[PDB]
């Protein structure tokens, strides 16, 4: 209710660079799983949260490299004996490879899927995912269909080339006597960001994750 | 931009109040301040150059930084065949001297 | 189409911009050779040199005319009006601009004539015009006998004064610039009127499907304002 | 004996004219390299750069002191006061002159100290000073505990600020010139006080056959006034 005014002195424009605008490491996913689904699985995408989705949708094509940081926290259940230093495996599955179906699955040993073995009591794991798209840039808006046949006409705006891959995290020494609950936080920091064809910002609230429908308010 | 008929004519007063002043209440107050006597009968569009604006976040809210006001100098004159009602649309932009700092989270969900 | 930018104000006008200079003399400041015999004035370059737009008048089919006496019309308006109330000596030119808004189906002719030292008439009486008759302010006066120009002269011969013709089929704007018209270097603004801008409908306005309204816009801007100094040091 | 001529005003002062410059910096206009980041101001060279003489105060044997906060003391006085009410941004220096009139049989010492950003104290309470306590206008305030300088500091250490001594047996006048003291290029005059001129009777005034009155005269003159522009054209 106080109408205060201050003299503003500014100089320089490096702060408003698109590299700095989109180069902020933000939460992209956060999931909790129990001792025994039994593991963490999530396909990498930006549209999970409204803020980052709106930030990215201001442009039509963005090409960037992805830096992923995994911050695990462990909370015990029910006597107490301390927080175990469980080993964690985080594996990136590209778009052309199968994903595991269980904790003791065969794809955990694949030599073509990058894997990071890190412990709870260590600094968070970190790896960089290069630009891994068929096209030269990601497309946030697709005015087209995947194919010429049915069961694809129901997927409008979905381009298979726009998928970023699957990230799977498990606990190698999962079986423990008592219990534990593990929370995984994924931080994504785009790097070498380049963007094209800016678009009007989104105004109406989102109605779905992959269909740009809109409602009132 | 005045989106009226070709023969529609008239005048308006486009006043600009510097920050800290009071917005005009009648045409006389508008004429005494900085203004342009826009005649849309001849010029279909007009351009205003605001000298400077400023603001930030400090409950504290930044004070007003001025107003842009329009008053109807004459009455609208149209032929019999033309429509008796017209419309005006406006646009905004910034110059090369604009700047921003301290990137934050936009409230628009 | 151009802009008549003058300091803080601007008017969108037509491409004509003939800008008839009264007696072929641009307004100018009082020369040094004549300023020594009287008190030295201080010139306000701002913001008295700006366009003051009066309320638009209505041009109907029975209008006789309108006259505005200067600097009486601006004696109580803006910075010029503020200045004349505090300085007892005044000297400036003028730049009067008249604009009309009409369709292509309207007709009528206006005579924008600046009459210097126009003394009012008061037809059919031996008593001079009262103070209320001459000092009409920014509202202005209305001609009662425009044929005789309200002074016993003739409107036919009024073209000897600086005048501009507005013919609705040819043009819609007029611009007359008036220099200092006085027999003395400076004069008192609150009691004497150097000029008198008059608009007379020589040819009546007429139409069939038109609005029969045709507003008229008048704008006056002092050109080279001079006032007696009010902050001269008395030391030494 | 000389004259302190400044535009429209002049004061007859003594030959001392020490003219202590605060922190050894003459007041000056805001430099171009710093004016690009903010709105460009327009400097009034007249008549804000003139001496404003307040009503004389009375120096008795029990006086505690007087303080005047700037530009609050001049916020409603003359052309400066008129300017601050219409422009929302202000920046200027100051030139404070204090003169005392006393006979050769009078004694007493005054400390004319200009305290920057002097925040008031309000002894023995947890509540801040009200608006009426700080903005006293041209009347000025009166110290209640001059020993602690009404802020919890010490008058003993107040000599670190720009100060001038008035010793009735040596001199009767003081002159302190203050530049722009702020962390921002320009500031709002109606809500913030950059300086605070204070006169404190360190040594009480005393006499036997004197008048016990000894009036004190205070004069403040803005030096380089700057205000935000109010007549910038919006065309083009």
mmCIF file of N, CA and C in Angstrom, chain B residues 23 29 31-32 49 61 63 70 77 80 98:
data_model
loop_
_atom_site.group_PDB
_atom_site.id
_atom_site.type_symbol
_atom_site.label_atom_id
_atom_site.label_comp_id
_atom_site.label_asym_id
_atom_site.label_seq_id
_atom_site.Cartn_x
_atom_site.Cartn_y
_atom_site.Cartn_z
ATOM 1 N N UNK B 23 -2.976 12.845 -13.722
ATOM 2 C CA UNK B 23 -3.547 12.666 -15.046
ATOM 3 C C UNK B 23 -4.605 13.735 -15.310
ATOM 4 N N UNK B 29 -6.916 20.607 -19.441
ATOM 5 C CA UNK B 29 -5.733 20.163 -18.711
ATOM 6 C C UNK B 29 -4.799 19.367 -19.611
ATOM 7 N N UNK B 31 -4.410 19.788 -22.888
ATOM 8 C CA UNK B 31 -3.753 20.696 -23.821
ATOM 9 C C UNK B 31 -2.603 21.444 -23.164
ATOM 10 N N UNK B 32 -2.698 21.704 -21.859
ATOM 11 C CA UNK B 32 -1.652 22.452 -21.175
ATOM 12 C C UNK B 32 -0.391 21.629 -20.961
ATOM 13 N N UNK B 49 6.536 8.677 -28.408
ATOM 14 C CA UNK B 49 7.814 8.248 -27.857
ATOM 15 C C UNK B 49 7.822 8.654 -26.390
ATOM 16 N N UNK B 61 4.825 -1.121 -3.297
ATOM 17 C CA UNK B 61 4.625 -1.189 -4.737
ATOM 18 C C UNK B 61 5.200 0.076 -5.355
ATOM 19 N N UNK B 63 5.660 3.350 -7.383
ATOM 20 C CA UNK B 63 4.688 4.394 -7.653
ATOM 21 C C UNK B 63 4.434 4.513 -9.153
ATOM 22 N N UNK B 70 -6.145 10.213 -23.787
ATOM 23 C CA UNK B 70 -6.734 10.684 -25.031
ATOM 24 C C UNK B 70 -8.040 11.403 -24.737
ATOM 25 N N UNK B 77 -16.964 13.075 -37.554
ATOM 26 C CA UNK B 77 -17.766 13.434 -38.716
ATOM 27 C C UNK B 77 -17.625 12.327 -39.748
ATOM 28 N N UNK B 80 -23.033 9.994 -44.786
ATOM 29 C CA UNK B 80 -24.263 9.249 -44.535
ATOM 30 C C UNK B 80 -24.074 7.763 -44.805
ATOM 31 N N UNK B 98 16.234 -0.036 -23.547
ATOM 32 C CA UNK B 98 15.611 -0.794 -22.473
ATOM 33 C C UNK B 98 16.596 -1.798 -21.886
#
